[PDB]
Design a protein around this ligand. Sequence first.
Ligand SMILES: Nc1ncnc2c1ncn2[C@@H]1O[C@H](COP(=O)(O)OP(=O)(O)OP(=O)(O)O)[C@@H](O)[C@H]1O
Ligand SMILES: Nc1ncnc2c1ncn2[C@@H]1O[C@H](COP(=O)(O)OP(=O)(O)OP(=O)(O)O)[C@@H](O)[C@H]1O
Ligand SMILES: Cn1c(=O)c2c(ncn2C)n(C)c1=O
Ligand SMILES: [Zn+2]
Ligand SMILES: [Zn+2]
Lengths: 49, 692, 242
Amino acid sequence: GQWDRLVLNTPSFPSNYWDKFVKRKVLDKHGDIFGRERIAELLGMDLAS
Amino acid sequence: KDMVVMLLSLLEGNVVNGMIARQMVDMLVESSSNVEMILKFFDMFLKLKDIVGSEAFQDYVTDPRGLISKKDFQKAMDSQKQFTGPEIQFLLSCSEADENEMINFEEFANRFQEPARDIGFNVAVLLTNLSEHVPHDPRLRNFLELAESILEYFRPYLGRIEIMGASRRIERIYFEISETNRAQWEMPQVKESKRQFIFDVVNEGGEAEKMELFVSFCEDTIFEMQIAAQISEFWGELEVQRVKFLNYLSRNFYTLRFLALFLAFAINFILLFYKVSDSPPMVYYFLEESTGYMEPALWCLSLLHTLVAFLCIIGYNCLKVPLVIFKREKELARKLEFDGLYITEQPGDDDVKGQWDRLVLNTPSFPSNYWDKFVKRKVLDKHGDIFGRERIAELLGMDLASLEITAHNERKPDPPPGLLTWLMSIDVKYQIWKFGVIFTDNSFLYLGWYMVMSLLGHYNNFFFAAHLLDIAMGVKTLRTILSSVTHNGKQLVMTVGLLAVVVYLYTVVAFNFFRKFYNKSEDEDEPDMKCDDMMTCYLFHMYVGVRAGGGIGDEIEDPAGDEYELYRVVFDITFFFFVIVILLAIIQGLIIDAFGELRDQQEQVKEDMETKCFICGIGSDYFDTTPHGFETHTLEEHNLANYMFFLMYLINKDETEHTGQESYVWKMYQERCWDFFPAGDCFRKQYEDQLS
Amino acid sequence: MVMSLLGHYNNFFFAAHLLDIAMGVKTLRTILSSVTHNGKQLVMTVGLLAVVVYLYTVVAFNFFRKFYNKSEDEDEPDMKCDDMMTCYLFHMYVGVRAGGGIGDEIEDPAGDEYELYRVVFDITFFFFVIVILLAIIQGLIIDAFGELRDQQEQVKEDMETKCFICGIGSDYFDTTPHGFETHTLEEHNLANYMFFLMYLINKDETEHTGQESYVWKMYQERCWDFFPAGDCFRKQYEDQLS
Ligand SMILES: Nc1ncnc2c1ncn2[C@@H]1O[C@H](COP(=O)(O)OP(=O)(O)OP(=O)(O)O)[C@@H](O)[C@H]1O
Ligand SMILES: Nc1ncnc2c1ncn2[C@@H]1O[C@H](COP(=O)(O)OP(=O)(O)OP(=O)(O)O)[C@@H](O)[C@H]1O
Ligand SMILES: Cn1c(=O)c2c(ncn2C)n(C)c1=O
Ligand SMILES: [Zn+2]
Ligand SMILES: [Zn+2]
C-alpha cells in the first residue's frame, strides 16, 4: 500500500486497466465526505480542466 | 422505549405471517407520517455525528475555540450533499447557539447521543422482527429503507439467536450485544481459546454441555482480563502499587516469557566462549575473548534472567491459575450437586483428584472463584432429606443456625485494619488445597522447573543450557513437530523395549556358541573377551551392534574359514534385518504416521466446520439452496458467538426484566437442561412453506 | 542474467545456470514443491537439531572430555573438546554425520569409571539425533508428497461432483441420462460466462437487451447475484419441464 501511494498522484495511473475514469469516480463518491479539493490533490487531477 | 418493548412483547411467539405482526404492519402504515418523523430524527443525528467527525467539517471550522458560526455550519451542511434544506434549518434551530451565533459542534453532536440509543435499538429490533416474520410485504420495507441508517448503526450490537421455545417451535430472539462484550470477545486470547475449543469438541465430546462450559469459562476469562487491564485504564498505598505491579505482569506475561527466551540465547551465546586449562587465568574454566566484559555481561544476564523467571511465575499465578481453580471448583460443585460424588457415591479410591478435593469441602471459602456462592446451600436442600441435614452440614462445614440467621437481618462489623488480620484470616485448608492444585498443574510445574534451573545456573552457569529447551514450548512449529513424537510416544517406548528383548536373545545365542568371535583386542598378550560375561556381552550388543550400520557382523571378527561360518552368516544377516532394518523402520514409521494423523485431524475438524452448522447439526447442502444461505445461517442465525453474548446478556439483565423467552432460557440454564439449543432444526425449516 | 554476465569473469558461474532445470520442467517443480511445502518445519527441525547437539556439547565439555583426543601420536594431542566452540563444531560436524553417532568418533569408554554414563550418552545421542530427528525431516518430506497428491485429487473430485457455478451436486443432474455433462458444458459452462462478458463489452450499450443490460449494470456496480447459486433451470421449472 505504501509503495502504491506514489502512483496515485500521477496523471497516467490507469495505464493498463480498463477504467480510465477511476479517479473521476473516486471523486464523485468520496468528495462530499472528504472534500473535493483534497481528493483532487490526492489523485493529482485538476477540477477545472 | 417502553411502548416498543410492549409492541415487541405482543409479537412474541408469533409465527411467520401471523395475525399480530400483520396488524402492527397495518399500524405502521396508518402511522406513516409519525414513524417517518421518528426514523428521520434518528437518521439526522446519527449522520450528524459522522459529519462532525468528517475532515471537510474540520477544514470548514475557523475559530480555535472549537466553535463554528451558524452560517459556516450551514454551508458545511450544504457542501456535504447529505441533508436537505429544511432539515439543515432544523439542525440550526436545535443548535445551542450563543448570541454571537457560535455553535459547539461536539456538544451539539453528542447531546442526543446517549438518550436515543436504547430507543433506537428497540426500533431496530421491532423493524427487524416484523421484517423476518412478515417477509413478503410491500409496505414495511419502505420503513426499512428509511431506517437503513439506524439498522446499520445498531447492526453490530443487535444479536439474534434461535431457540426451541416451549411451544415446540423454533423462535428467534433479538437482544443487545454491548460494545465492551463484543470488543472483549474479539480479543486475540479469546479467539485462540475459541479455536482450541472447536478443535477439542469436533475431535470428540458432548456438544451442548461442552459449549456451555466453554461459555462460562470464557466469561471468567473476560473478568480476569478486564481486572488485569483495569490499572492501564503505610500499607494502603503499597497495596495499591502492588496491585498495579501484579496487573502489569499479568497483562504482558507473554512478553516476559519471550524476553526470558531471548536471555537464554544471549547467555548460551556467551557460554560458547569457554576454555578449560590447567593454568589459572584441578583445572579452571574461564572465558576467552578480546573485549574483557564478556564476563560482567554474563553476570548481569544471569541475575536478569533469574528475575524474569520469577516474574513469569508471578504472572502465571495472577493470569492463568484463577481459571484452573475455577475449572476445578466448577466441576466439583456439579459433581457434588447433580451427582452427589461425596454425598451418595464416594471417590473411586484410585482417583487422586476426588480424594484431594475432599479437603476443600469443609472450608468456609469453597466457592471462591466460581459464580455460585450458594452451592453448599443447594446441596443441603437437595440431599439433606436422604442423608441427614446435620451430616451434610458437617461435610460442607456450614452451620445450620447461622444459615437462617443470615436470612434474617444480619449485622457485621468491619474488621480492624491490620496486617495481622490478613495473616490470621487465611483459611489454611483451602489454601493448601489451592496450592496442591497449582503444583499439580503442568504449566506451573514447567515454570517452576524453569526457575529452579535458573537458580542452579548460579551454582554453575552451564545449567542455563537447559533453558534452551524452552524454545520447544515457545514457538508453535516446534510444538507441532514434537507433538508428532509425543503422539505415538507409547508405541515408541514399547518399540525400544522390544529392541532390548530381541538384542538380549541375540546376546543369549552369542554367549553360548559364537564367543570366540568377540575378541576386541589387537595384541595377543591382552585379550579383551567381550562376551565372557553376559552383562558385558549384552552391553556390547546393545551399544555397538545396534549403532553399527551393517549390524553386529561389522564389529565382531570374521567368520571365514570356521566350522560355524554358515551359522555366523545367518546370525549376522538376521540381526541386520530384524534390528537395523525392520525395527528402526518401525520407529520412523510411527513418526511418519504421527505426522499424517495430526494433519488428518486438522483437516478433519476444519472440513466439519465448513460442512455443518455447529449448533443446528444440519449440513451446508440444505442451507445453500438459497444464495450464500449457509454463511448467513452461520453468522446471522446460529452463531456460536451470539449464544455466548446471550448468556452475558441474561446474567447482566435484571430478573424482573427478563422477557418471556429470556426467562425460559434462564430457568433452563440454571437447571442445566440444554433443550433450548436448536438441534436438527432451524427457522428456515420450521417455516419453510410460509417463508418459501 | 547476472550469473550469465559473471560467467565471463569466470566461466564456472555458468554452472549456476543449471539450476534453471528446476524451474524449467514440470516434474522437478512438483518434486521440489514437496520440500518447499514444509520448508518452515524443515528449518525449525534443523534448528532443533542444533539446540540438542549443543546440549550434548555442554555435557561432553563438562564431564567426558578425556574421550575427545583425535590424535594418534602422544607427542601431539588434539583435544577436540578443550573449547566449547571447537567441541560444538566437532559434534555438529562429525557426530551428526556419523552413522552410529558421536560414539563412533570419540575414543572407547571400556574400562573407565564413566563407562556406563558414556554408554547412555552415546546411545541417547544415536536415538535422539540420528534416528528420530532425521526421521522427522524425512517424514516432513513424505507427508508433503501425500498432501500435494491429496490436494490434486481433492480439487479434481470436486470438479466432477459439483457444478462450478450452481454448486449443485452431480447426483441431482444425473437423474436424467448424462444430465450432469449437459448441465456442465451446455447450461452452466464457465467458458460461456466469460464469452458473455466479452460479448457485453463489445456490444453497444444502446443495443443491449433487457437481460444483457441487467447483467451489465450489475457487473459495473460489482454485484454477483445474477450468477445462479443453488438453483438451475431444471430446478426452477422441474414440474413443467418434467
Ligand atoms: N454455528 C456456527 N457458528 C460459527 N461458525 C460456524 C457455525 N457453524 C459453522 N461454522 C463455521 O465456522 C467458520 C468460521 O470459524 P472462525 O472461528 O474461523 O470464524 P472467524 O470469525 O473467521 O474466526 P477467525 O477470525 O479466527 O478466522 C465458518 O466458515 C463456518 O462455516
Ligand atoms: N460450470 C462448469 N463449467 C465447466 N466445467 C465444469 C463446471 N462444473 C463442473 N465442471 C467440470 O469440469 C470438468 C472439465 O474441466 P476441463 O477444464 O478439463 O474441461 P476441458 O475442456 O476438457 O479442459 P481440458 O481440455 O484442459 O481437459 C468436467 O468434467 C466437469 O465435470
Ligand atoms: C453470575 N453468573 C451466573 O449466575 C451464571 C453463569 N452461568 C450461568 N449462571 C446461572 N455465569 C457465568 C455467571 O457469571
Ligand atoms: Zn445453525
Ligand atoms: Zn451449473
